[PDB]
Design a protein around this ligand. Structure first.
Ligand SMILES: OC[C@H]1O[C@@H](O[C@H]2[C@H](O)[C@@H](O)[C@H](O[C@H]3[C@H](O)[C@@H](O)[C@H](O[C@H]4[C@H](O)[C@@H](O)[C@H](O)O[C@@H]4CO)O[C@@H]3CO)O[C@@H]2CO)[C@H](O)[C@@H](O)[C@@H]1O
Length: 375
């Protein structure tokens, strides 16, 4: 139904070290989106495990993960929102919830896949919130969640990756998605994120076993490329006797007006062309800056989320986008993970690729476009 383009992007020099070989072997990722990350108050149901299906509508199965592996993905990102699953002053995670998350991790481990688990939609005062006012509780939350999760998974091999937090930011604010680094409120949030990323690393390493050397992903503000590129971002100090085990996490649905902006919002575009510098510009730019600051210096970078939402059937554009984005990243030593939220029609964000109920690929052309350039 679509024509996959022949993409010509020269490879950059990629330092030969273990971390960048690891990221290369991850190859390309698929997010189990809108699954364990679903989060909201006042559930109509009694069984907390129904959060798994409240948004995506389909319970995860081993056959589903098998299907994702068979299509060529070698990484599964399993975002998890924990705040609807904790009780008590020290955020005890419900055993049934953590048990179910572990069952799904096991589906992926059986397929010899890389697996990323995180803290996702927990960005609220009283849980994870990056400012001085709420920092003491945020430290307690990061410490408690990651002590519990890291302990459960301590004897999992290095294919399992921990990601500190998804998109740490101030919410319901002009600064939620953009910083003015001359403003003290923004400087404070960047500092809080540095502190909480250090707490995360220290907490994980302290639990022993394979957690002493496992790869760990950390974002900057809002997981934006810009806010790991600022001078104020700090890679946490790592006590691992293995060097270079911290991976920079970024999310980049770029160009925004094509990939993520809703099609009924003024400014949205539905066309993307491999022959247009206007389509390519924003992809090249942030990847170039990340290559300059991190990859070229040997520091690994993973794009944990990208994608392009369907806009009234714009398949050819999304096919060209996906091929270009994956090749641009691979040429710079970076591996990417598509956000697959099992959403295909309606007014929502229609990022789905796999129809989970049938295990059929709705957009195999997009998958094939990525696989052509992922290795
Ligand atoms: O229909 C069920 C439920 O959907 C809720 O909306 C979901 C979207 O369906 C889902 O695609 C979205 O996924 C996020 C992901 O969790 C984030 O890590 C990241 O967030 C975006 C952010 O949404 C943008 O506003 C911002 O500009 O960019 C970041 C990425 O840089 O990316 C994806 C895609 O947006 O999560 C939503 C929930 O937060 C509806 O809210 C709910 O009403 C529906 O019931």
């Amino acid at each position: 139904r679509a024509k996959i383009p022949e993409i010509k992007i020269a490879s950059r020099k990629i330092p030969n070290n273990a971390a960048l070989k690891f990221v290369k072997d991850m190859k390309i990722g698929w997010n189990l989106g809108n699954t364990f990350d679903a989060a909201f108050e006042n559930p109509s149901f009694d069984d907390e495990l129904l959060y798994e299906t409240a948004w995506c509508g389909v319970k995860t199965t081993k056959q589903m993960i098998d299907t994702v592996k068979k299509a060529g993905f070698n990484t599964i990102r399993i975002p998890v929102s924990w705040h609807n699953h904790v009780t008590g002053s020290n955020f005890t995670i419900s055993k049934r919830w953590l048990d179910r998350v572990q069952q799904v991790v096991d589906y992926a481990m059986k397929n010899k896949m890389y697996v990323i688990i995180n803290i996702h939609h927990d960005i609220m005062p009283g849980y994870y919130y990056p400012n001085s006012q709420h920092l003491q509780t945020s430290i307690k939350y990061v410490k408690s969640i990651w002590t519990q999760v890291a302990t459960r998974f301590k004897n999992y091999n290095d294919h399992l990756i921990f990601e500190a937090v998804n998109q740490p930011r101030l919410t319901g604010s002009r600064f939620e998605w953009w910083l003015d680094m001359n403003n003290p409120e923004c400087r404070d949030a960047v500092e809080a994120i540095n502190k909480l990323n250090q707490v995360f690393v220290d907490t994980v390493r302290s639990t022993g076993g394979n957690n002493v050397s496992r790869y760990l992903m950390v974002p900057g503000y809002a997981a934006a490329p810009e806010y790991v590129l600022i001078d104020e971002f700090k890679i946490p100090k790592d006590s691992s006797k293995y060097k270079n085990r911290i991976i920079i996490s970024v999310h980049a649905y770029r160009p925004y007006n094509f990939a993520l902006q809703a099609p009924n919002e003024s400014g949205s575009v539905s066309e993307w062309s491999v022959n247009s510098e206007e389509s390519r510009r924003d992809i090249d730019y942030f990847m170039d800056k990340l290559y300059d600051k991190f990859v070229s210096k040997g520091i690994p970078v993973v794009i944990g989320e990208f994608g392009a939402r369907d806009k009234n059937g714009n398949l050819q554009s999304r096919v060209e986008f996906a091929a270009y984005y994956v090749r641009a990243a691979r040429a710079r030593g970076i591996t990417c993970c598509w956000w697959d939220n099992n959403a295909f029609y309606g007014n929502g964000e229609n990022f789905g690729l796999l129809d989970r109920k049938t295990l059929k690929w709705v957009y195999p052309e997009i998958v094939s476009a990525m696989m052509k350039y992922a290795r």
